Amino acid sequence: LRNDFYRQLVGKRILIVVNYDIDAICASRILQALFKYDHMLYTVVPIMGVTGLKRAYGEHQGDVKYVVLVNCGGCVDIVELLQPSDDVTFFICDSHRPLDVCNIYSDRQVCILGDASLEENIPAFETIFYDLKQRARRQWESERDRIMFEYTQFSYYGRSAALMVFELAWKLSKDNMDLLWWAIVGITEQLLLGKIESGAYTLELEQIQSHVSRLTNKTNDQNTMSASKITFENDLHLVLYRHWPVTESMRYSRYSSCQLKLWTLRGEKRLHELLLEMGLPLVHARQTYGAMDLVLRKEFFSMVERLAEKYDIADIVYGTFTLSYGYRSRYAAADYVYALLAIMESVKKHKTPEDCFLEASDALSRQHKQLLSAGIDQAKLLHAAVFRQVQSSLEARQVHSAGSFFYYVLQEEHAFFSYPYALGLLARFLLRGHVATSRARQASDLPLIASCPLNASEGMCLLVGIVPVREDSPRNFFGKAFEQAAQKSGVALLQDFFEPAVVQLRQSDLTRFLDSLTV
Amino acid sequence: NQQDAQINLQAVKKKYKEFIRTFNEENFFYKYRDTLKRNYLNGRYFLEIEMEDLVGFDETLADKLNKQPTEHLEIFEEAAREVADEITAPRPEHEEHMHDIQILLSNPTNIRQLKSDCVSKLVKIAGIIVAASGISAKATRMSIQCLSCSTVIPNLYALPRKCNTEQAGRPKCPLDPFFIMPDKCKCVDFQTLKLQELPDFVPQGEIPRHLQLFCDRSLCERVVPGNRVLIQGIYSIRKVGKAVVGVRAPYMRVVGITVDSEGAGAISRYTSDEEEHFRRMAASGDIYERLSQSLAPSIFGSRDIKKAITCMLFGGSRKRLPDGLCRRGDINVLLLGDPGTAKSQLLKFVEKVPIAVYTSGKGSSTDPQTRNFVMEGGAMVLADGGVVCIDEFDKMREDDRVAIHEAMEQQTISIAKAGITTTLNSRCSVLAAANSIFGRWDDTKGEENIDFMPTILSRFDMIFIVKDIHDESRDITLAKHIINVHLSSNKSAPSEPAEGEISLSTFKKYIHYCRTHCGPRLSEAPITVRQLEVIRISESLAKIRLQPFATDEHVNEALRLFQVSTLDAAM
Amino acid sequence: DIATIQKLSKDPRIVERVVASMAPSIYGHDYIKRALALALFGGESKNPGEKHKVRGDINLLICGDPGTAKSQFLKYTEKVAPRAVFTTGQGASAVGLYVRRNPVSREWTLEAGALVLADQGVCLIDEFDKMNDQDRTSIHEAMEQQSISISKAGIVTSLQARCTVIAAANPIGGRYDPSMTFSENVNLSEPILSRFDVLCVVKDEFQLAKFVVHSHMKHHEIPQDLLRQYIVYAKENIRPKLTNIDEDKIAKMYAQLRQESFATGSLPITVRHIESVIRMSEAHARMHLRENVMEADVSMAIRMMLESFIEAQKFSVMKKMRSTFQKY
């Protein structure tokens, strides 16, 4: 509840828009507007790491007390870090979810937007910030069965960033259909069960539906061009259906690749033998869907929904949205998020990251739409430069087992991969390839680790983490796992990024780090 | 007006016209509508469109349109005129008369993919232009005395039995008293265009096939050979049938080509920050000897003597006189020596660094259609402002060695195959390259390198010889100037970092300003008659220091470069 | 049927294994077994930046004798190669090997050059020295500037040259010249020979007779029905490059042997005399799928230069022997 707090927001302020995410601009551009709505001038932040926290804020030692927190909170007993707080209020809407109870109380300088049916963490203040010696430790450890089961076993993230702001705002006589699209941006940002879980997706089939299947404020005369409100249909999050031909999906898609084995040949013969059953032509299977003839393009999903029932891929039907403005197009919300990462370009100007952040935040406007096309372009070639290591690897087998996980190392960087999060993708593309498919799953379901050649930043062995698949919701030990060798030895380690699952070693102090970390 | 489907009218009736009048979003800019206005800035009489905006309206015309565009694009013509002619005046008070128009459309394909199935159909492919004809003729209508009706035509028969010199009583007039009367006629253009397939789609073990094309009105005078095209046309016909049974007609026509902009070459046919780039380097008086390590921007040679190029590319000045002569503004320079010195690849680069052609000897060098004898010409083609540098003078036939004597010392050109006299000339020049007899041991002695004439050594200037001189000190260096120069094949980028030894394209336009301003001059002021007759290089330095003027002996810097040459013919 | 190649055909023992099956006619002249073990085995683009496309051609010949095998010289490779184009030389060679850009109108036919057909193939030749110079103009600059020039016709066109040159010529004025120079052993030109790469020579002074009669009594190792696709792999797969390993040594091979072997027949030493080497020193890894290059493949390449070259110089013949057999 901020119906009482929001109305305090008239004085000076800052709108931090926190460390790297799509969630940021989605849940802020709304309010970079709303500030001039209340006749408030706005002020924003490029953040890349907790690095950025006080090298930016320390430049601003004031008392501007209407303050944001997103994507952080798993940081410090935040007065102990943000000590220049005397009564300076903060406002949190963070997704960096599992927070310590040091940070809520002293309940002047924070606001608790936390309410859940999980009441399991109460005496942590009655244990840590309160703690004869023997029994104190008896409590300490026998309840750290639960407490250290928090914050020393795994980590995860929660819910939206401005769906709260939607919940505030649909009451305030605001129906920014565009901003509902922005909400969907934030949805498939990380609520995609392909990335991080919803589960209740199947019951948000009602939620925003009931928001807008309610609402057609022009229920009788809605046949105009601009800003026609959006419409629900059961659709895909297969890779980039729209502007490239079917065969590009049928190649560059994982949920084929995990179930159909496409990088090899029998994938292709088998594919053809299904395009028989669809009876689509081959030219027509190699022109952009928007480019093809029509009745095939029209009748596509009508057949594909049903007579894909039988062929090892059960989970291609999803629930999604898609729209245009006028007559140039029909965009799709899922045909955007893979464009989003395209300006996340890690060039060696020092200008690129922040100014590309400004560019992206300039992007989600209807007025600013030219540039997005170039992003789509880049994404396609990225998706096909994936292969630039896949078959060379999965057939050469760079794979390392290395005990009770699987082990990978790349040893040469890509300008493609200076931007880091490729390191998550290729893992999630290829463990399928051999380590899942040429075997039973018994050697398949373990997570994986991925070196990161830093050919540009002097050599620092960047990393990200991975789960086993088909049991995803069981949170990542990697939230902790890599503290192991850090805790056993510790070796030039940083946790400079917002995220737990991210680290930075030295170029050549990584193997003994492993042999420590093997366990 | 069979309005169930395939109607004769709907398009021009209300539809395509109204699509035009619906192509409308605010700012009051989103128009397919004011386009032609700014076409009417001149009377261009055309307009461009898409193939994926109709789809922004419907899914019903896209399939109906692409099938029979031989009809639809003239429906669109009629819509165009009957809409646009509204615009000459709001109400009836301005019109000279209307006129005619054009409409222009916009996934590629190839030539070995399109056949009997792909007929009466519109296509996107891409190729490479070859050559094509001129601009002749075609009309739409005219009439005849006999009936005097505008001879309506379906396609861009011959008045059957009705005569119409007829209703005069009885007296009849069968079998066509039809003298076609073109003074009543209309009029169109033609070119008959042409393509070659890619260099990527198996012309190797097979033959490269191709086909012919066909244009109409304003799209000629647009395209010349050595270009790269994308297109949309029609697969259509010209013959009839049922030729051991029925072999027949290939061609296409045009609708709306889209050509290429290939990168950085084509400042050829169709800034001042770059002038700031130009001039602040010449503000430095350090170009004469600085760019003596630039013309070979990445490898060794001519080093202390490359300064003598500063005069030639800018040249001297074609300083005409009141009297007869048009002086030798063109002036020539030489090289000669053995192979291995990178002498093959150096001049290979020089074509990359103004305009010319480069090989040596017999390889430039002294139709079955519409009965006209073509003659593509001589050697001023790419060299009249362009100049050349070539090997194999004596290594060449002596039939095509008169021309050099006419070309070069004077451009005394003429023609005598048929009976007419090309009185051609040029501002052109050459360099010579060599693998003739015995090099440095020859050059000091007398005069037999060329085994026929003493003339040569006539109207040429600096004699700078190519050698592989034994120098044990420089042996290891050019033993090491050669590996990674070759190996990794890597010398691309870091030559451009130099101060002014850089940026080949910038250099190209540096020069094509530098000489290209006016005919600057000099000031007041062993020294023989021919060496002298270098006076033209007295003129040079005012383009080199970019002066108006200079005196004799500061520019006898070149004499320090030429006295190097004089040791060849010292005595 | 892949169990042979990946285990057997990438060793340097293959210059016996392949040489076991290289020229199944007689034992003779074990050099060219090594040579043809290299000869179909190269081709490379590596066009540099800003300069041009540089070089990927091979260029070979031997001077034979009437009675040698300079006719029966080249047969076996006709069937096998990925590309092969054969022509016996003049006697019936034409100039078609005159294009005004006058496309071949109906029932009018005029022809043009076969060099682009089997671009990245070869010209298999006897009577090379017999052909006509105006054809030689086309034949030359393919090998020099990777292009050739149609001469002052309607078009001055070219013809693409990513390809290789081989031949089987005959001597000049007789049979064979001694270690006396080779321009006079057979009368080619020099500036055509400037672009030439590989050599070997066949004379004979005094097993075989029992062989020949056994072979005349035919009353009636590599597999034969694949052996192309390995050479495809050698022409396909493995392609490393490197910096100067120790080839700075050649500043001596340049300077010393320019000047120790100074004045008998000792010009023909160049960087193109080792650009020739560069084309095939790499190719040892085309054979072996090495992915790198050491002085191992160097010394064997020098064993080819060491052996081909010594015949092309005056009968002061030891000039190669002490000077380079240490590098054997």
Ligand SMILES: Nc1ncnc2c1ncn2[C@@H]1O[C@H](COP(=O)(O)OP(=O)(O)O)[C@@H](O)[C@H]1O
């Ligand atoms: N100083 C040098 N710097 C770079 N390359 C050189 C040098 N000297 C010789 N070369 C080599 O010589 C080759 C060109 O030889 P070339 O001039 O064609 O001989 P010829 O004139 O007999 O045909 C080039 O490929 C180049 O690698």
Ligand SMILES: Nc1ncnc2c1ncn2[C@@H]1O[C@H](COP(=O)(O)OP(=O)(O)O)[C@@H](O)[C@H]1O
């Ligand atoms: N070293 C050799 N190895 C195998 N056969 C040889 C050899 N030397 C000569 N011959 C014989 O020479 C014959 C071919 O002679 P040939 O090549 O036709 O002479 P020419 O080349 O002048 O026509 C063959 O039948 C072959 O048996």
